[PDB]
Amino acid sequence: GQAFRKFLPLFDRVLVERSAAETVTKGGIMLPEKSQGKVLQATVVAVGSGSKGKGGEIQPVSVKVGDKVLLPEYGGTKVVLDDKDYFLFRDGDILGKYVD
Amino acid sequence: GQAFRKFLPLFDRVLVERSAAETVTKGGIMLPEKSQGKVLQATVVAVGSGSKGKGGEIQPVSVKVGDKVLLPEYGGTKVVLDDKDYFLFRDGDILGKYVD
Amino acid sequence: GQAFRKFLPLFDRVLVERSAAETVTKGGIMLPEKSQGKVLQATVVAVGSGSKGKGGEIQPVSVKVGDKVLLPEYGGTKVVLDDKDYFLFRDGDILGKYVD
Amino acid sequence: TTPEEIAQVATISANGDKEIGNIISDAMKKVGRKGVITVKDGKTLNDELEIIEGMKFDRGYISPYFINTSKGQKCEFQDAYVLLSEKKISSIQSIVPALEIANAHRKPLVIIAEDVDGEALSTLVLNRLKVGLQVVA
Numbered sequence: 001g002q003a004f005r006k007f008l009p010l011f012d013r014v015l016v017e018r019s020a021a022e023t024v025t026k027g028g029i030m031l032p033e034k035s036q037g038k039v040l041q042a043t044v045v046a047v048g049s050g051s052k053g054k055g056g057e058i059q060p061v062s063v064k065v066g067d068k069v070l071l072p073e074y075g076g077t078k079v080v081l082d083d084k085d086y087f088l089f090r091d092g093d094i095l096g097k098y099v100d
Numbered sequence: 101g102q103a104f105r106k107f108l109p110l111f112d113r114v115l116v117e118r119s120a121a122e123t124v125t126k127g128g129i130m131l132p133e134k135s136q137g138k139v140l141q142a143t144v145v146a147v148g149s150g151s152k153g154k155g156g157e158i159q160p161v162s163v164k165v166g167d168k169v170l171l172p173e174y175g176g177t178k179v180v181l182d183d184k185d186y187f188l189f190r191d192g193d194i195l196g197k198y199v200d
Numbered sequence: 201g202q203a204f205r206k207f208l209p210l211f212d213r214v215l216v217e218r219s220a221a222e223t224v225t226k227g228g229i230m231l232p233e234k235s236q237g238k239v240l241q242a243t244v245v246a247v248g249s250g251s252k253g254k255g256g257e258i259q260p261v262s263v264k265v266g267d268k269v270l271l272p273e274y275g276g277t278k279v280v281l282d283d284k285d286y287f288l289f290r291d292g293d294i295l296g297k298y299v300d
Numbered sequence: 301t302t303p304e305e306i307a308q309v310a311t312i313s314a315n316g317d318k319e320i321g322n323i324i325s326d327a328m329k330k331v332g333r334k335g336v337i338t339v340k341d342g343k344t345l346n347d348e349l350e351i352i353e354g355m356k357f358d359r360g361y362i363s364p365y366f367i368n369t370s371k372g373q374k375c376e377f378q379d380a381y382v383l384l385s386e387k388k389i390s391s392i393q394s395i396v397p398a399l400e401i402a403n404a405h406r407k408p409l410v411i412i413a414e415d416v417d418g419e420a421l422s423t424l425v426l427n428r429l430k431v432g433l434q435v436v437a
């Protein structure tokens with residue numbers, strides 16, 4: 001498992017950083033910050049060692065560090081690292097990764 | 101799994117796009133857009149790698165990209181790819197597919 | 201599985217067509233249509249490929265196409281094929297088949 | 301057939317007051333013989349005639365921050381776009397494209413609607429007080 005800023009999540013837990021919320025549209029219209037909601041696009045900054053769903057070997061996490069992923073509405077835990085916000089999810093709670 | 105528009109769904113999730121809602125009948129009567137409801141017909145544009153029902157091998161998705169499917173009323177996640185709406189379902193949530 | 205009207209249900213899903221409700225008794229008294237309810241007798245017109253209840257092999261559906269079956273009062277999904285009504289049930293939801 | 305006859309009728313009917321007859325003849329010259337003339341009280345000793353042209357209605361601002369003319373505490377635009385809504389504009393997505401048009405064409409925007417809720421008001425006031433968008437609701 002990968003550790004981010006002296007933090008290593010346990011089991012199949014993925015620590016991500018949410019992307020910056022948009023404030024200016026394509027046409028130049030500035031947006032209010034209060035009506036921005038929560039950003040569903042994140043990047044994976046830490047992964048766990050995985051879980052033991054099958055006996056014997058350990059299962060690696062499907063995502064890796066440096067992958068942009070799509071988050072669900074609910075299911076994250078707020079982790080404060082150096083007064084910066086990150087969100088802890090499960091491996092199965094991730095909807096899908098943007099590939100390039 | 102197969103990605104669509106730089107988006108690859110994870111596990112057994114399937115990304116589809118709903119078919120265009122009908123607006124004129126076969127007799128020639130135009131329909132109001134607010135009474136159209138939700139279109140249950142879709143086509144599979146992206147598939148995931150699948151889940152692991154048994155130990156060892158990984159189970160692929162039953163549907164493939166390019167298959168027309170019938171969706172349930174509830175159980176989809178709205179995904180906004182380049183300001184176009186797609187819907188993420190599970191592999192087991194698909195009711196059936198239209199063969200030809 | 202066996203398709204019907206270009207529709208093949210997925211997993212252990214059975215598409216049936218409900219029998220016609222009775223409108224005239226054995227003596228000659230006509231029935232109102234609004235009190236007929238739902239017919240619990242149907243015939244199997246499409247079967248899926250089955251479910252992976254055990255590892256390895258695929259389990260065939262217990263019913264086949266052309267079997268008269270008894271439906272539970274809850275558990276069906278309405279499917280409109282060629283502007284005609286059919287119902288999707290699970291394989292285990294079917295109560296019993298009329299043998300002859 | 302003459303406005304002098306109109307003034308004579310209005311003067312005779314107002315107990316020989318020729319100023320009332322003259323002011324009714326002027327009002328009827330301006331807004332027409334079958335036009336709308338409304339009598340109300342005045343805070344001044346003398347009678348006066350006010351002509352309201354165009355489409356004036358008794359609905360003010362929604363936000364006081366829309367003032368761009370501090371001399372009369374009023375909003376003043378020229379050659380302005382107008383967006384008319386039969387329903388109350390509530391979602392931000394219902395106001396972003398109109399603001400995008402009004403900014404891409406560099407023209408003011410008057411949004412006349414049933415009401416404007418807090419999200420759309422916050423977007424309008426933020427774009428007025430931050431980047432300088434000529435809008436009024």
Ligand SMILES: [Mg+2]
Nearest residue numbers: 312313314315
């Ligand atoms: Mg009189």
